[PDB]
Structures are given as structure tokens and as C-alpha cells.
Ligand binder design. Structure first.
Ligand SMILES: CC(=O)SCCNC(=O)CCNC(=O)[C@H](O)C(C)(C)COP(=O)(O)OP(=O)(O)OC[C@H]1O[C@@H](n2cnc3c(N)ncnc32)[C@H](O)[C@@H]1OP(=O)(O)O
Ligand SMILES: CC(=O)SCCNC(=O)CCNC(=O)[C@H](O)C(C)(C)COP(=O)(O)OP(=O)(O)OC[C@H]1O[C@@H](n2cnc3c(N)ncnc32)[C@H](O)[C@@H]1OP(=O)(O)O
Lengths: 450, 450
């Protein structure tokens, strides 16, 4: 099995959303604290009618149909997520509802967990499966599904929701560079979910971004080393046409790419000109911990990175800026954002991917894109995903109705025996959407279509 | 990479346990309803001092040391479990505590979830990784960790706890037969954990065993077909020296193997003599659903299987009968049970493995064992594991103290800010054991050694 990677992808996000300007107004935020300070435009959320299972059915059904793939042809199916509705019954078993109709039950894989990183873990597990002595010749399919929610406080504005499906196989338009990658894994308490009964994480910020950066530095050094072995030169920011990052909120995407540039300094690589060396050297006396901590160093770094960031990163930002944190699916939404904007320039390019998950699991990895027959082509993928069309099928909420909805969802998380109220909501969803109809007194879940 | 499978394994279970006879007395069970009816001897449980993390540290530390493997040499590390203490921070990140001392943080893998089946999923993911274009030449390491507990009622007697570690690599004494295997996956509600705040599952029994059997039938047919392709004959119970099953309780191990024999009937294979054909044919008029449901068919099947079961299955039962349900680790405890009893006869044999997890994820798969240099040898593995020694280092509790303990554990599951009471318990654990010292008010966990 050769040139294995991503053959096809498709995305779903709830059409229901709230505008960030409007929300600054609703909280008492200073003007542009969400739109500029966080970097965010719009925030998509599950109502009572939607969840990570219904979203997942939407993405799978949609990939299958539109790419003309038939369901007997899926031989591995894995789900990444951190949104747990059941502590033992995996989302993967729910998806099996879709395969029971054609009698394909010989299908490997379960759910992968770790924070905004489980999807990546799954997609690796799938690449490895196509390449393995146990491969039965069929496609793998990976789902990234999640629903990001915070309590009332300052972290609410960073929520989002989405499912993403990827079809995995040989002779792909999006090929893994097998050896080009670095991971960092650690034991930290930057972001976690110790409240069994709550939908909401416990989140430190004085580690949140520290640990993202600690991990990014380390995955970056490890990819650098592998590159010097493989290609005979030091890696710098010039050696890839694009960097795509986990996108909890856009501000952090900016900082992260800036940080790559600052790392290129540290190593004297060939993307740090005479004048950057000048601007940076004020800071070479910082301890490592000091370098994570310096608001001056950030400013300097972001400022140096701005034109590089327009060529290498801005086109990866559409979806994240318009939907919000997608946890496991966030990186892969940024990647779809890049296929949508730049697919005609991508043939023959190198896209570098950085995945992250708090508690601390992370992998930077590399992809070589190329030319290939429909349906498994960069253009065809941009066409099926239809990002533009979907951004246009949205339905705005006043920050007040958003709040009420958040309250409702707080009441149904981990609850049993209710029927979902459809009035005025069902009509808001695309024909053919899967929606939660009810939860019985034994917590069993029941889903509708159309 | 050739002849990849399991290079080394080691096991841990809490020394603290309660006797089944004694427990029949304590509940008002009829005599031998646990010892004969369930098939169980003894039941191991976590006190406040222990959990799936501390257990996991015990197995890893113990594998590393005793097999003289150094920690920089682990390049993939994955955990299977269904015991969630955090909804986003994986047990894998906690294990990273052990690797931070030698600075090895480039280590792939997260947790795999689905019920008594996540460990299997991990170990497959690891086999596939050694065989993949992305393999960096290092060992994989898989952990199965869990702590089985039920509420008061009839299911309490089936609890257990254990961690198991497996080292994965090429040129193994325990080699995967890459193509010889079948999975069945489905959407069912036989056993699940919808109570976010509870340690205890919701469990149906009129599906519990139905679904185990539905899945076993189906994984069996799929392995059969792959065998007819590969070896040119119909598979029957004679074509393997051993069948090792997921072992929630021993009664079900008996039924399951009986069922294989009944399936061998259905297909007229070469292990159903003239007289079995006679005894079975009363039942060939049953619907499929009828065949899962018939207490007469069971009796007949178990009875036909008894001498085959003594040769092919009894030696896999030591640990499960003495420790209890180990969920993800249960199958791999049964396998250790088989290495302990029969290691001198195993060189050149075929051991067939059946893994299961409710909600419905399952895989039957096949292993070819053989002769190989220490430390990676069947004899050396039987020596390091030291099952006998460990069974002897136990510490009995009166069913009354067991109950009190269960009550305590109910109070600490999902709780914060306590210090664990060590009096009279710490002294009960082996020198070098990892134990929970305290949980702070932000739910962060802190572990001791010795
Ligand atoms: C999810 C992951 O995989 S890792 C990332 C962390 N994890 C998360 O889940 C994010 C959850 N979110 C959070 O915890 C919070 O939203 C935080 C910490 C990101 C937000 O921080 P807060 O304490 O709300 O406000 P803070 O004062 O830090 O402001 C945020 C940013 O907006 C800037 N800002 C504030 N007001 C304005 C304004 N009116 N105009 C422009 N910028 C503004 C701040 O200066 C800061 O930006 P900078 O970093 O560019 O200086
Ligand atoms: C965990 C998994 O991966 S799948 C397996 C199901 N899952 C679990 O988690 C198991 C949890 N356990 C349970 O739900 C329960 O312990 C059950 C359903 C297994 C036990 O059943 P109960 O309703 O307690 O009692 P039941 O009357 O069914 O008795 C159990 C067995 O003991 C037999 N029995 C009862 N009393 C006696 C006795 N005194 N002597 C000998 N046998 C007895 C019963 O006949 C039955 O055995 P059989 O199947 O050989 O006929």
C-alpha cells in the first residue's frame, strides 16, 4: 500500500450560531475584545436537537453519498472526541447504526481520547492500519466530532461544534510524509474535565497557552531533526508552503506561527534575515520559562511574522474564525479551510500540521499534496465540502436566546427521559439532517432524519 | 518488521480481596451460587489507596525493570480502559510521569475506549504501528487497566481489578497471524455507563449474554472464512490448541466455548462426531434468536464440550477465577494464566483469542507461539510475571470490611480535596507499589511509591 493518506473529506457544523460583536455587547466586553482580542467572528452551537452523534451521522452520510463510496467498503472506522455522553459505550458503536443496513459489521476501531487531539490519534491509527499486514484492502474512515462549551465566565466566547469525516486509503491526493513528524507528550493540568456531571472543563490560562507552546517548541525541534536527516539541511519556515494549527481561537493561531519564527531564530536558520536577528537579540538572555512568559517577545515575534503569516496561514482560518473551537475537529477544519481557498495552488505543495490536546498530547506532522483523479482530487474535495454554501445556510441567534439555549443544554447533559422540543428549531436544519428525538428512562438515545 | 507481536508482559492486581464462599454467606445467596453458579473463587478490589493509574504505574515499572528494557526505547504507548477519572485528560498522560525522568517525550498514542475491549483496540493499534512506514524502530507498549465495580445488587460479586502491560515489537515469541481474524461491531444497549457521576454500569442480562454470543458467533464465522482461504479447509475447534476468552466471570467462559462447538455443528465441520450430530439435531429447528435463548441448548452444548474444554480452556482460567472481572485486562489475564500453566508446551502452538466489549465491539484473532531467546521467551515471561508468588501475597477481607470499602469508594469517585487514610492499608501493599496519597481542590492527583 503506497501514498496512503486522505482520499476524501466532508464537514458538518450546526447551522445555529451567535455573532461575536453582538456578544461583546451582551456581556460587558470592551469593543472588539472577541473580534480582535480573540480573533473570532461567529460561534456555532448545538441546540437540544443536535449532538456529537447526530453531527457524526451527518458527516459520514454526506461523505459516503457525495463521494459515491459504498458502505461495505469501510473496513476500519474510528472516532476522535472528548465529549463523552456515555462512559463505556463509544460513539463508534452508535455509528454502526449506519452500517447495519448493508450487513457490514466486520469493521475495526473504537474511540480515541485525549482532549483536541483524539482525532489525530485516530487518523494516525488508520494510516498505520492501511499500511499493516492485517489490512484487508478496504477504506478506513476517521471521524472528528466535538462540542465545545464553557460556563458563563470568560471562556464561553471560545465555544464551537462540528463533525469531520476523512476517508483513508492508498494513492491519495493528501499523502503522509511518513518519517517527517515529532510528538511531545507530558503530564500537566492546563485543561481537563474532572467534573463528571458537568459539560464544562476546568481551565488554567497561565498554563493553557504555556503548554501549547512548550509542546509546539518540542514537536518543532523533533520535526526539524528528522528533516535534517532526510533532506540534508536545517528546516525553517520556508520549507513548507503552509502551516495549519489546532485552532481553539484565532489569536493563538497567530501566536503559534510567530513562535515557529522565534524558534527559527534560536537555531540560526535560513529565514531569519539580518534585521530580524537584530530585533530578536534583545531577548536571547531569557530562561526557557521566561520565553513562554514574555508579552514583549510575542509582540516582537508576531510583528516579524505578519507577511509570512499572510502567505502560509491566513488561508487556513476561514472555518475556525466562523464556527469557533471544534476541539478534535478544529485542526481538520483549518485544513478544510485551506483546501477551500487554495486548492488550485496545492498540487505539489507541503502542508505541515500541528495537532494539540491538553493534559498534554501533541504531534506535528507533514503532508505532501498532489494531483489525482476525481473523485479523489483536491478540486473535487473543495467542491463536495461546499464550505461557501454551508456558511450561507446559517441561522443567527440573539445572544439572549444563545444564553437560554446554553441553560437548557446544561439541564440535558447526563439527563434521561425527555423528548426534545422541535418547534421553531427543526425547520432551521438542512433537509436530511440527523437530530435527537428523545432520551428514554434507561438513557437510550433515538435519532431522526430529514 | 517481521513476526511482530508480544515481546513481554507483566501484571498487577490489588492484593486486597474477598472470598466468594464468605460472600455468599454475607449476602443471602444459596450455597455455591458464586463458586459454582458464576464459577468464581476470589475477588480483588481497589481500596482508597489504589486506582487504574497507580495500577498502571505498577505494571509499566515492573515490565521495564524486570525485562531490562530502558524507557528511552518506548516510541508508542497506548492505554485501554473504561474506568474514566477525567473526561478529557487521558490515563496515558499520567503515565508520562514515568518517562519525564529520562527525557523521552516523543511517544505516540492516547487512550482507546469501548467497554472490555479498549485494550485489544490498543494492542492492534500498536501491532499496526510497528508494521507502518512511520515506525521509528522502537518498542510499543500497551496497558490494559480497569476497576470493575457494581452497585449492591446481583452484579457486585462479578467485580475485579488489574493492570496489564504488553511490550510490542518484531521477532516476538507471541506472533500475530495477520490475516486470521474476524470482528463484529453493532449498536446495542446490553451494558453501558450513562450515569456520569456513578462508578457503576447500567446492565441488562437478557441481552448481556445474548450480545456476547451474537458477537462470538459472527467473529467466529469470519475467522472461519479467512482460514478456508488461507489453509484450504474448514476451521473447527481442533485447529487450535487453545481458546482464550474475555473472562467477565467463569460461567460465561464455559458457555462461550460450548458455543464454538455448537457453531461447528451448524457447519458440519470435522470435530462433530456421529453422536454429537445425534445429540444436537433436536435443535436445528430453532430460529437464530431462539438459539441464543435456549437453556436446553446450553446444557447440551456444555456437556458435549467438557473434555475439549479441559484441554483447550481450563488452563486459561487461573487468574480470572482468582481476581474477578478485569474488563480490558480480563482477556490478557486469561492469556497470562495460559502462559503460566502451559509455557513448556506452547512453542509451536496456535492460541485463538476472543475479545469483547458491550455496546458491541468484538474481535476474534489468532496467535502463533514459538521459541525465542530470553528475555523474550515463553519461559522468561512465565518467570517474570510470577503469578504464584503474587497469588500468595494477598490479604483477605471479611465481606463486611469489603462492603464498607465499597461505600468509601462510592464517596471518592469524582470527589476532590481529600487525603487518603493510610493506617492499616499501606502496610498491606508490596514494597515499591504506587498509591494515591491525595486529591487537591482542583482535582489534581498525587501518588506515592514504596
Ligand atoms: C483549547 C486548547 O486546545 S488550548 C488554548 C486554551 N484553551 C481553551 O480552551 C481556551 C478557553 N479560553 C480561555 O480560557 C479564555 O478565553 C482565554 C484565557 C483564552 C481568554 O483570556 P481572558 O482572560 O478572557 O482575556 P485577556 O485579557 O487574556 O484577553 C484575551 C486577548 O484579547 C486582548 N484584548 C482584550 N481586549 C481587547 C480589545 N478590546 N481589542 C483587542 N484585543 C483585546 C488581550 O490583550 C488578549 O490578547 P493578546 O494575547 O493578543 O494580548
Ligand atoms: C462484562 C461483559 O464483558 S459481558 C457479561 C455480562 N456482563 C457483566 O458485566 C456481568 C455483570 N453481572 C450480572 O449482570 C449478573 O452477575 C449475572 C446476570 C451474570 C448473574 O445472574 P443472576 O440474575 O445473579 O443469577 P442467575 O439466577 O442468572 O444465576 C447465575 C448462574 O448461577 C446458577 N446458579 C444459581 N444458583 C446456583 C447454585 N446455588 N449452584 C450452582 N449454580 C447456581 C444459575 O443457574 C446461573 O447459571 P447457568 O447460566 O449456568 O444456569
Amino acid at each position: 500500500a503506497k501514498n496512503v493518506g486522505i482520499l476524501a473529506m466532508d464537514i458538518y457544523f450546526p447551522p445555529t450560531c451567535v455573532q461575536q460583536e453582538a456578544l461583546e455587547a451582551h456581556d460587558g466586553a470592551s469593543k472588539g475584545k472577541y473580534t480582535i482580542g480573540l480573533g473570532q467572528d461567529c460561534l456555532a452551537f448545538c441546540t437540544e436537537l443536535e449532538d456529537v452523534i447526530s453531527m457524526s451521522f451527518n458527516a459520514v452520510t454526506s461523505l459516503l453519498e457525495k463521494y459515491k463510496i459504498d458502505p461495505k467498503q469501510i473496513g476500519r472506522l474510528e472516532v476522535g472526541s472528548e465529549t463523552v455522553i456515555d462512559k463505556s459505550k463509544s460513539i463508534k458503536t452508535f455509528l454502526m447504526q449506519l452500517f447495519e443496513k448493508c450487513g457490514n459489521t466486520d469493521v475495526e476501531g473504537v474511540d480515541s481520547t485525549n482532549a483536541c487531539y483524539g482525532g489525530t490519534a485516530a487518523l494516525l491509527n488508520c494510516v498505520n492500519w492501511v499500511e499493516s499486514n492485517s489490512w484487508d484492502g478496504r477504506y478506513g474512515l476517521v471521524i472528528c466530532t466535538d462540542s465545545a462549551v464553557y460556563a458563563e465566565g470568560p471562556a464561553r466566547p471560545t465555544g464551537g461544534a462540528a463533525a469531520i469525516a476523512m476517508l483513508i486509503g492508498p494513492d491519495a491526493p493528501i499523502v503522509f510524509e511518513s518519517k517527517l513528524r515529532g510528538s511531545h507528550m507530558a503530564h500537566v493540568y492546563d485543561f481537563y474535565k474532572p467534573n463528571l456531571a458537568s459539560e464544562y472543563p476546568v481551565v488554567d490560562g497561565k498554563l493553557s497557552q504555556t503548554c501549547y507552546l512548550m509542546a509546539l517548541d518540542s514537536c518543532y525541534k523533533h520535526l526539524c531533526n528528522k528533516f535534517e536527516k532526510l533532506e540534508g539541511k536545517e528546516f525553517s519556515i520556508n520549507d513548507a508552503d503552509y502551516f495549519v494549527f489546532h485552532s481553539p481561537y484565532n489569536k493563538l493561531v497567530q501566536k503559534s506561527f510567530a513562535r515557529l519564527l522565534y524558534n527559527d531564530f534560536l537555531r540560526n536558520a535560513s529565514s531569519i534575515d539580518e534585521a530580524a536577528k537584530e530585533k530578536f537579540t534583545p531577548y536571547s538572555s531569557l530562561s526557557l520559562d521566561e520565553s513562554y512568559q514574555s508579552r514583549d517577545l510575542e509582540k516582537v515575534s508576531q510583528q516579524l511574522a505578519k507577511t509570512y503569516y499572510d502567505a502560509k496561514v491566513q488561508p487556513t482560518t476561514l472555518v475556525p474564525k466562523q464556527v469557533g473551537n471544534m476541539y478534535t475537529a478544529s485542526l481538520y477544519a483549518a485544513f478544510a479551510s485551506l483546501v477551500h481557498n487554495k486548492h488550485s495552488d496545492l498540487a505539489g505543495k507541503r502542508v505541515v500540521m500541528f495537532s494539540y490536546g491538553s493534559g498534554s498530547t501533541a504531534t506535528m506532522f507533514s503532508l505532501r499534496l498532489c494531483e489525482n483523479q476525481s473523485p479523489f482530487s483536491l478540486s473535487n474535495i473543495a467542491s463536495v465540502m461546499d464550505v461557501g454554501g454551508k456558511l450561507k445556510a446559517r441561522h443567527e441567534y440573539a445572544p439572549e436566546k444563545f444564553v437560554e439555549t446554553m441553560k437548557l443544554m446544561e439541564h440535558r447533559y447526563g439527563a434521561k427521559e425527555f423528548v426534545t422540543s422541535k418547534e421553531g428549531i427543526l425547520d432551521l436544519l438542512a433537509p436530511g439532517t440527523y437530530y435527537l428525538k428523545e432520551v428514554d428512562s434507561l438513557y437510550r438515545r433515538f435519532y431522526g432524519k430529514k
